[PDB]
Every structure is written in C-alpha cells, then in structure tokens.
Amino acid sequence: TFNMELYNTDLFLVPSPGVFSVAENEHVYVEVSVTKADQDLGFAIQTCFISPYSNPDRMSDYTIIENICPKDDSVKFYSSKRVHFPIPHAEVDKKRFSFVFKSVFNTSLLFLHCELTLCSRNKGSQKLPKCVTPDDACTTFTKPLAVVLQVD
C-alpha cells in the first residue's frame, strides 16, 4: 500500500533494481507513493534521514526533512502525481524530491528512512490532520519506510 522508489534521473522513469549505489555529490531521486480508495485522503513527507541502521529508534543527525520541512538545502521538490486505476477503483498518490548525497558514515551500507504522514485533503476535519505542503510547513496516521543505499 506504501512505496518508496529510487531513480537514477529526475524523470522518475526507471527505478533502481534493488540497492541503489551512490557517491558523494550525486543526486538521489526519491518517490513515495500511497495506494488507496478514499479520494479525500492525502499524505505528506514528514521526516527523512540517512542512517546506518535498519532501525529508526536510533534516529540520526543526517536529517533531510523534519516535520515536513526540508532541513538539507540540497533538497528539491517535484510535481506530485495522482494516477487512477480505472477498473479497481483506486488511486496512487506519488510525491517526489531529490537531494545531493554526502558520505559521512563509517560504513558503506546505509538506509534512507522516510516516514509518511496521512492527512485529509478536504477542509473541516477533526478526524485527521488537514494536509500541508513542504515550505508552507516551514511557514498514528504515520508510516515508516526504508530503502537501502550503497556508497562508492
């Protein structure tokens, strides 16, 4: 129901076939996606950080996005993409951003941890947070996802 894809270009055409290889100073194109029936339901990208653990309890000082705000300055957002399944009555909501990688760990095997927050895409709604955009954000309904990175 939730996805996280890495791509080699800002066309998000061709996802990497497992473990993404990355060197300092390169871009990484992330795509996150929610697949759902409700059409009032959106999401935002709450937090993203790199870390050498498959574990997020040991969070990390390498934070890219925090409370929907871009903390790393290399970060760019791209158009979001709602794509309809006609016959299954479904919608994939996708969001996209890049950043420039910096190696700073003591190891070559890393994790991109992103967490999605679900939210309500229509005004007047106790039931979940209304929705908000990334620099608008600079001014339980949350899902953790991890993808693997390989430094060279």
Author numbering: 591 to 729, 745 to 757
From the paper:
Transforming growth factor-β receptor type 3 (TGFR-3), also known as betaglycan, is an ubiquitously expressed cell surface proteoglycan that serves as a co-receptor for members of the TGF-β family of cystein knot growth factors, i.e. TGF-βs, activins, inhibins, growth differentiation factors (GDFs) and the bone morphogenetic proteins (BMPs). Many TGF-β family members bind to TGFR-3 first, and this interaction subsequently facilitates the formation of a ternary signaling complex between the growth factor and the receptors TGFR-1 and TGFR-2. The 785 residue-long ectodomain of TGFR-3 can be subdivided into two halves of similar lengths. The C-terminal half contains next to a bioinformatically delineated ZP core domain (residues 454 to 728) a so-called external hydrophobic patch (EHP) that is part of a stretch of amino acids that connects the ZP domain to the membrane-spanning segment in TGFR-3.
The polypeptide chain could be traced contiguously from residues 591 to 757 with the exception of a stretch of 11 residues that is part of the FG loop (residues 730 to 744). In case of the bridging residues 730 to 744 in the FG loop we observe residual, however non-interpretable, difference density hinting that this segment remained largely intact in the crystals and that the lack of defined electron density is caused by conformational disorder in this segment. As previously seen in rat TGFR-3 and other ZP domain containing proteins, the overall fold topology is reminiscent of the immunoglobulin superfold and comprises a β-sheet sandwich formed by two four-stranded β-sheets (strands A, B, E, D and C’, C, F, G). The intervening loop segments (termed AB, BC, CC’, …) differ considerably in size and in case of loop FG also contains a small α-helical segment termed αFG.With the exception of strand G (residues 745 to 757 in murine TGFR-3, see below) the structure compares well to the corresponding rat ZP-C fragment, which was used as a search model during molecular replacement. Overall, the root mean square (r.m.s.) deviation between common main chain atoms in the rat and mouse structure is 0.7 Å. Unexpectedly, the amino acid registration of strand G is shifted by four residues in murine ZP-C when compared to the corresponding segment in rat ZP-C. We therefore conclude that the shift in the registration of strand G, which contains the EHP sequence, constitutes a genuine difference between both structures.
